[PDB]
Nucleic acid binder design. Structure first.
Ligand code: MG
Ligand code: MG
Ligand code: MG
Ligand code: MG
Ligand code: MG
Ligand code: MG
Ligand code: MG
Lengths: 182, 144, 96, 217, 25, 53
RNA sequence: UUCGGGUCUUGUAAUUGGAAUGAGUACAAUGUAAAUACCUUAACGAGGAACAACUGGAGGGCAAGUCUGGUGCCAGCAGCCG
RNA sequence: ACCCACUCGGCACCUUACGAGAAAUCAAAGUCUUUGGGUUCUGGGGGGAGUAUGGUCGCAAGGCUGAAACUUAAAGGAAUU
């Protein structure tokens, strides 16, 4: 009889399974951003949709009306923080025009790739999974982390691991050992 | 015009009329009369276990011709006798007389499948093990 | 040009038509002891036409014995030949 | 090359008509497909389907192929062509031409607040052909085309970015549906909206300004 | 079969049924 | 027996020991390469599984 | 003038090369009522035969073959059309 | 009593639809995705079946009321060569 825990399904499947063009688009997207699943894409889409729902609702209310002024503004701020909206477009009307690419071009994946540190997206992903790459001296394991624009300045290798300068570890170490008494 | 009443105080008529009409919608009727419990061999349930009486080959409907390999089953829960199709090429010789079998529906919601006349049920599991598993040779039938 | 007579294999039986039932079914008195409800299986619905007291090569259904398949048909000469060879118990009379 | 019958065609060839806009304005009948080509260089041609269409004779049956073609850019211009011929390629080609000939303008509009560049339709518009009624509804930005794939393609061709649909009747007979959609699209111009209230000039037609350039002498 | 004839047949059947019922009673 | 004859008849052909497919994100990458990076041999109507005959 | 260097970019080969890693194990220390497990970590822990992804499909609906054997209105498949 | 012209009410009809409709056709079967004048009744794939049963009304024949199991991928409409 303890208080229930809240779950939420964070993605939504397409309403039509084998829409070929759509499928191809999805594939292309995956290729672009080193996505393990269509599931990731779906998640992103769902997120976008949620935002859109909010925005539309806000629009439906009169402009300069309190609720719109507040909630909508907050949403806009959030978007700007995340780095999906640009400073030109703090508008709420522009929130509807966002599209899936802007969210994917903001993952700790893509960001990692686009700052050096990588050589292709797959490599970056591997690095992320492998516990290389820290943000604010905090090692991030998550490929789809959503880099918060002000933290984007701080993406670097960890103080642990090689690459960012510590003990080589595992394979290199083994090699060294082998070299040692020979 | 339009057959329905429209007036701001009609409401009741709209309700009652709708209720009356609803009975022409078959699914609704089924739900309300409770024909899933009173009739139907499965007691409104997704699956049922039964004991194999005998193995019967059934001749398919027209355009087609082939002996289908079904099984006459008597269900444990009520005692009603039903025909159940045994899917896949071998499989009929996995069954035998006096064997406990798990039957699902066919996939037509009470109606008969394809060309097999009077058969409304699949065979899923014999003596506790999946037919598919047996067929693919992933497990063996642990006698009866 | 001539046709050949084909002998019965294991799971097969020589039968005679007793009566015309309908829907593609024939009551067959098998030369074994049993009088079975022999269902005409696909191939002989098409062209190979039955009579009344004709000899038919019946394939026995392994799991269910009262119902059986009909595979092949013989005329009168063929029947006689079979009798001579000792394939049939002697009562095969085809002259219609 | 090309040598034109019809005055309009001749005018087009001359260069006296700069855009199809003028033609649209003066409701001038486009009867040569080359005019369209000249004036709209950027037309994408989408073949919707090819279906068999049969006629019983004493010996066998004559089968013909019905080609349904939609044509357009992304700037409010669409054509729809139905053509039956025995050869499939030929049918397709003819259909394309027909579509081009048809080509219609679209009243693209805003959902709410005219922020920048119209995305949707200006009004809720319906079109009816056969039994198929296709209702098209102005959608908010970034909602996409919400349509049965056939209609969706047409919408895309037209250049509508965001639109809701409510296709009713026997939509499965695709040709009819397409026709209905086309009709609906057409209807967008011909709706008298408050931002069109005020009376204008009535310009002399390009068929009358350049009457001398018309006719081969 | 004509619908009228079917109806007639049904009626005939019903007469017999009625008779049977009466007998039972 | 009438039942299960075709299966019995068929020659028991064994699966060839192959190099394993790179499962996951790698697989997706591979697919992408096959389709939209290489764009190898395009007929107009771009085919997926062509027959070797 | 025929090549071709291929100066630049791509894919494919049981070719070959150093790097990276947690899945496991495991000193410890956390954790904990005492423990598990997590999070943290000394030590071990990757080269195809491994540290092997399955589940369903490839006529249409509906993404994907008129490839190769077998079967021959049979065995079967097929929600529907077949 | 005719004749002409107008006018209400009626049985219809003729031609066009600019409207409807799947079409045959329709001055309503129009003023319906540009959907709301007021209202009563009836239908919700085809069979089973206007059957079974229970009422009720009939001297009786019958009427009014009226199922389900099960069955089936069509039954139908208008037009086409
Ligand atoms: Mg570490
Ligand atoms: Mg497989
Ligand atoms: Mg299969
Ligand atoms: Mg296959
Ligand atoms: Mg396909
Ligand atoms: Mg009904
Ligand atoms: Mg008719």
């Amino acid at each position: 009889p303890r208080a229930p825990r809240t779950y939420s399904k964070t993605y939504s499947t397409p309403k039509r399974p084998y829409e070929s063009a759509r499928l191809d688009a999805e594939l292309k997207l995956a290729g672009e951003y080193g996505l393990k699943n269509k599931r990731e894409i779906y998640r992103i889409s769902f997120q976008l949709s949620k935002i859109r729902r909010a925005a539309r609702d806000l629009l439906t209310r009169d402009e300069k009306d309190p609720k719109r002024l507040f909630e909508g503004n907050a949403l806009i701020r959030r978007l700007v923080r995340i780095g999906v909206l640009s400073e030109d477009k703090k508008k709420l009307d522009y929130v509807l025009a966002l599209k899936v690419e802007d969210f994917l071009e903001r993952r700790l994946q893509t960001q990692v790739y686009k700052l050096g540190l990588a050589k292709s997206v797959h490599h970056a992903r591997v690095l992320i999974s492998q516990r290389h790459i820290a943000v604010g001296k905090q090692i991030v394991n998550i490929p789809s982390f959503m880099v918060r624009l002000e933290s984007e300045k701080h993406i670097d290798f960890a103080r642990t691991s090689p690459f960012g300068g510590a003990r080589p570890g595992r394979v290199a170490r083994k090699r060294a050992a082998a070299a040692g008494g020979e | 015009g339009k057959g329905k009443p429209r007036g701001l105080n009609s409401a009741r008529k709209l309700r009652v009329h709708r209720r009356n009409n609803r009975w022409a919608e078959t699914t609704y009727k089924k739900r309300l009369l409770g024909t899933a419990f009173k009739s139907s061999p499965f007691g409104g349930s997704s699956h049922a276990k039964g004991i194999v009486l005998e193995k019967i080959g059934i001749e398919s409907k027209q355009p087609n011709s082939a002996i289908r390999k079904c099984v006459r089953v008597q269900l444990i829960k009520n005692g009603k006798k039903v025909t159940a199709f045994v899917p896949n090429d071998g499989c009929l010789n996995f069954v035998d007389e006096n064997d406990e079998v798990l039957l699902a529906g066919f996939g037509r919601k009470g109606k008969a499948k394809g060309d097999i006349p009077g058969v409304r049920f699949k065979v899923v599991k014999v003596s506790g093990v999946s037919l598919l598993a047996l067929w693919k040779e992933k497990k063996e039938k642990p006698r009866s | 040009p001539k046709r050949e007579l084909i002998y019965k294999e294991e799971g097969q039986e020589y039968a005679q038509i007793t009566k015309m039932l309908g829907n593609g079914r024939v009551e067959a008195s098998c030369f074994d002891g049993n009088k079975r409800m022999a269902h005409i299986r696909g191939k002989l619905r098409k062209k190979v036409w039955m009579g009344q007291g004709d000899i038919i090569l019946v394939s026995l259904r392994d799991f269910q014995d009262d119902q059986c398949d009909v595979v092949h048909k013989y005329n009168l000469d063929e029947a006689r030949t079979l009798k001579n060879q000792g394939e049939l118990p002697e009562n095969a009379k085809i002259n219609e | 090359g090309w040598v034109p019958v019809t005055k309009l065609g001749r005018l087009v060839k001359a260069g006296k008509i700069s855009s199809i806009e003028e033609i649209f304005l003066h409701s001038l009948p486009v009867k040569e497909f080359q005019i369209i080509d000249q004036l709209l260089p950027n037309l994408k041609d989408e073949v919707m389907n090819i279906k068999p269409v049969q006629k019983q004779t004493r010996a066998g049956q004559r089968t013909r192929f019905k080609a349904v073609v939609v044509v357009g850019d992304s700037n409010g211009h669409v054509g729809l062509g139905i053509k039956t011929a025995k050869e499939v390629a030929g049918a397709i080609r003819a259909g394309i031409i027909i579509a081009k000939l048809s080509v219609i303008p679209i009243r693209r509009g805003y959902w709410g607040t005219n922020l920048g560049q119209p995305h949707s339709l200006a009004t809720k518009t319906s079109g009816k052909c056969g039994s198929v009624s296709v209702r098209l509804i102005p959608a908010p930005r970034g909602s996409g085309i919400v349509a049965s794939p056939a209609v969706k393609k047409l919408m895309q061709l037209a250049g509508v970015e965001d639109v809701y649909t409510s296709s009713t009747g026997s939509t499965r007979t695709l040709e009819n549906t397409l026709k209905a959609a086309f009709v609906a699209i057409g209807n967008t111009y011909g709706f008298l909206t408050p931002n069109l209230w005020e009376v204008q000039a009535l310009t002399p037609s390009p068929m009358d300004v350049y009457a001398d350039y018309a006719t081969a002498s | 079969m004509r619908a009228k004839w079917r109806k007639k047949r049904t009626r005939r059947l019903k007469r017999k049924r009625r008779k049977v019922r009466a007998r039972s009673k | 027996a009438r039942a299960g004859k075709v299966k019995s008849q068929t020659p028991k052909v064994e699966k060839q020991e192959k190099p394993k497919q790179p499962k996951g994100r790698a697989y997706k990458r591979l697919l992408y390469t096959r389709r939209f990076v290489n764009v190898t041999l395009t007929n107009g109507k771009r085919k997926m599984n062509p027959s070797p005959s």
